[PDB]
Ligand binder design. Structure first.
Ligand code: FAD
Ligand code: FAD
Ligand code: NAG
Ligand code: NAG
Lengths: 477, 500
């Protein structure tokens, strides 16, 4: 019944299950093969709007006919919420809403939200080698959900999250009225930058800040074997020191198991905004134990750092293992024996199919108030630990391993609330069935911003049309 | 009004009800009416004043005022900058907690139970009678009641070492709108969080606080350095202070005061210049303070003869006053009407801008006008904005305070002039301070920031976000749980989500 409403309002943009190009659309950005066997990943329909009129028509029809909407930019949702539901749903995919307009003179760019971050980086790089928008590591990440949840990458300690560099946005309201930052008010504008944007509206474009980047950016990857080297108690120094090391430098740690003769390997990877000479000087000054040899570094343009962590046009292809992620915030460093007890669990799974990662939260992330955007994890956070398990299509063993490791780490991590990064979506922390129960997941994502979030939600979508597993609830039923 | 007094006398059956008949009504009302700007006002007169001695009196008062439409203004010390604890635009009665001042100090468990009508001086005295190595960091004014002080945040010379006074609260006792006496466990952690640093008067009546005790070294060093801002480029030390005081050693708190003081020209005449009182407390010996100052601030030229080392309590005496039983007297420096404003600095004030702000001190009488810097470094970085309702934690360089004072002589052209001075200084500083929201410290109450009507939440957010950046929203939630009918209401009280 619903599809008649759409076509009557405003073609060949409606992809029903019968339509011969249906499945290829659906799989293309359902990017978590853990959810492939699910029986909730088949929507009634998929709209790929080209203009805001299509978005308004879709919202109008889906509200008036009991259909749920699954907003999609890139499909990188760790829990795959953007392409599945337990209710009759339809995907509004912003694939073909992706225009990018770069303003070198004003240091800003209007990027339509269905564009990937690799595209934004590429189109900034062909205009300047000294402007950039700092983002996540994965270059296939859609801009829409990325800026909706906020964004952490190798450059966040210098410039903050991606949501800390947003100037304006354009959005489709539950009423279907097109509104930018100026006409929407700054409570809702506050919401969309780092709150659950799918629970506030469908965001079609963002005017985003561009930031200076030196013409020399240096990356490095240092592989060191955790098994026995007492020399790598730099990790011990790293935990208690990396959040206050010079903010141009972000070192990310990855823990996995790899065969050498099965032992535990440590991948120390980093970006530094400056020349290799100065990077070597700084890190030898602070962490002379890592032994970062100059042959382990790479200077270049910023875009080459982007390439390193992913013919100088390689960022425009979105063609590239099932997995689950958990995240945790450390406000005091993990005691050593506890850390080794956590790491030995890596052998409980197949070689290199499980990761434990440290993401540092220093520099500019201290400077920014917990209320600046919905993301509250600013000051006192040493880093964001990521638990990771991988496999292909019993699955319960992988999930049991991840949940066990998390629960072992329980007494040593953030407590009230137990922090959780929104980009690392994790349905275990809580779901919606009212506000008391939903606060369980809300306060973990947003410490006290969750309450402002509910207030804005009740004003903005009182009927709770924009609802999903982790949508901000409304006070009015 | 009649039903109310019959209810009070009937409910819990002595001389704790002070009606207008009672010859000591005026003295009780005046005793903690501590802002002489409000002396000529016609709203500072309650129907009656209750001086509870037990929680039963407070419960009875809440019950009767609920059933007869009477408003309650909780008062502990009366230091409210806007005098809200002794004023209202409606028929109100004061619950004066003066005789709720019992103190139980526990050296071994490092905690103390303070009845809210005790002043901070009394609490300091009773800790000093037990150990010289325990302390409670508080506001500078020792006549400040514990109740309203802990209701708001509380800032002192040790907040950079220990956080706010509200950051060291372990337990509380409370009278809710239902008259139920409640501790931390029975009140819940949403309400327990609320009362610590939110508009605690807007949630209930807090009768006592169990507060954390903190260790202090056996030698604490104060200093006062007089420096001339007018011409001495050395005392452009300020430029460095702004950019360094938030990361200097947290055992150190240096507060600066800018005022106008008469000088003599050396040509015969009296000239008016800007004097700077650079004062500090350091938790440690005088030697370590002097060396620390040479490393961090060689510009003060801080000669040791400007310091005074001693026991911890001696700093309280130094910053209030000789025979050290003087903390049980709740009368202090000589009465002067005043108005205060505040702002939070996230980027250092540009030098010419600070100089132009300071020139405004010359517009008023000599030394009746102040601009002060309270630095926000140290442990105030460590504590999350959501830990208690106070949100001004990390990234704040300091808290600028504007202050203007005067005496009883009014022609109301002078009184209008002083307020215009304070507002002009504020509005000039606007583009250079915290913006959206414009921060404001709750202990420095300022009705100009915005008030409640006499949309609901839209308008209340105006002042709320400045006092409480985003915690204000959580605050309203707990209020709807705790006092949905908004019985505990005043000029800047958290509103309720339910309509009336
Ligand atoms: C897959 C992946 C993800 C990732 C990463 C690396 C890879 C390979 N590295 C990250 C990193 O270093 N740091 C970080 O903080 N996150 C990282 N991620 C996660 C990624 O940032 C997030 O998944 C991202 O926020 C989602 O982007 P994407 O747009 O691709 O994902 P989605 O499923 O389509 O959407 C996510 C949620 O937002 C809602 N949504 C989507 N588009 C919109 C628009 N336009 N308006 C409103 N809401 C929108 C979806 O409904 C879903 O809930
Ligand atoms: C007068 C003064 C104030 C002051 C100061 C020095 C002086 C001489 N120095 C301060 C400083 O260095 N740092 C700082 O942060 N504040 C400083 N102040 C301000 C002072 O702390 C506050 O004005 C404080 O509110 C005063 O406390 P007091 O106990 O005097 O409170 P009040 O005037 O009677 O009432 C004001 C508000 O508090 C509520 N209240 C009072 N008692 C209770 C109880 N028991 N329960 C709940 N609420 C209570 C009143 O209802 C009113 O809202
Ligand atoms: C109370 O304050 C008034 C100010 O209006 C003052 O004149 C009077 O002296 C005070 N009360 C007493 C008993 O002195
Ligand atoms: C009473 O109302 C007036 C409004 O004219 C306001 O200025 C004042 O602050 C209110 N409160 C008191 C205690 O007078």
């Amino acid at each position: 019944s619903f599809l008649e409403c759409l076509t009557t309002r405003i073609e060949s943009i409606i992809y029903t299950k019968d339509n011969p190009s249906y499945s290829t659309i659906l799989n293309s950005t359902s990017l978590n093969p853990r959810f492939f066997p699910s029986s909730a990943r088949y929507p009634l329909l998929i709209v790929t709007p080209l203009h805001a009129s299509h978005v308004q028509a879709t919202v109008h029809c889906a509200k008036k006919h009991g259909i749920q909407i699954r907003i999609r930019s890139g499909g990188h949702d760790y829990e795959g919420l953007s392409y599945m539901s337990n209710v009759t749903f339809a995907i509004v995919d912003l694939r073909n809403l992706s225009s990018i307009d770069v303003d070198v003179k004003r240091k800003s760019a209007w990027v339509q939200s269905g564009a990937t971050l690799g595209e934004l980086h590429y189109w900034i790089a062909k205009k300047s080698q000294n402007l950039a928008f700092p983002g996540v590591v994965g270059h296939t990440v859609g801009i829409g959900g990325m800026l909706g949840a906020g964004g952490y990458g190798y450059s966040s300690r210098k410039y903050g999250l991606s949501a800390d560099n947003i100037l304006d946005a354009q959005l489709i309201d539950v009423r279907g009225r097109i509104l930018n930052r100026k006409s929407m008010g700054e409570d809702l504008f506050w919401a969309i930058r780092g709150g659950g944007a799918g629970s506030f509206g469908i965001v079609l474009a963002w005017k985003v800040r561009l930031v200076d980047v030196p013409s020399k950016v240096t990356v490095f990857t240092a592989i060191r074997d955790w098994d026995n080297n007492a020399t790598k108690k730099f990790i011990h120094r790293y935990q208690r020191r990396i959040a206050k090391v010079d903010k141009d430098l972000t070192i990310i740690v990855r823990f996995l198991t790899a065969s050498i003769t099965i032992q535990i390997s440590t991948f120390i990877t980093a970006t530094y905004h400056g020349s290799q000479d100065r990077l070597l000087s700084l890190m030898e000054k602070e962490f002379p134990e890592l032994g970062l040899l100059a042959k382990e570094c790479a200077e270049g343009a910023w875009v080459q750092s982007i390439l390193y962590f992913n013919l100088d046009v390689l960022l425009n292809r979105t063609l590239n293992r099932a997995f689950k992620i958990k995240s945790d915030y450390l406000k005091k460093p993990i005691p050593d024996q506890v850390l080794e007890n956590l790491l030995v669990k890596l052998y409980e799974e197949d070689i290199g199919e499980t990761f434990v990662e440290f993401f540092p939260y220093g520099g500019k992330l201290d400077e920014i108030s917990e209320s600046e955007i919905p993301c509250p994890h600013r000051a006192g956070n040493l880093y964001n630990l990521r638990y990771m398990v991988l496999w292909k299509e019993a699955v319960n063993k992988h999930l049991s391993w991840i949940r066990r490791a998390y629960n072992y780490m329980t007494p040593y991590v953030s407590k009230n609330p137990r922090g959780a990064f929104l980009n690392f979506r994790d349905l275990d922390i809580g779901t919606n069935p009212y506000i008391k129960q939903a606060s369980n997941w809300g306060t973990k994502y947003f410490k006290n911003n969750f309450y402002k979030l509910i207030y804005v939600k009740t004003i903005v979508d009182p009927t709770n049309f924009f609802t999903y597993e982790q949508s901000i609830p409304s006070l009015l039923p």
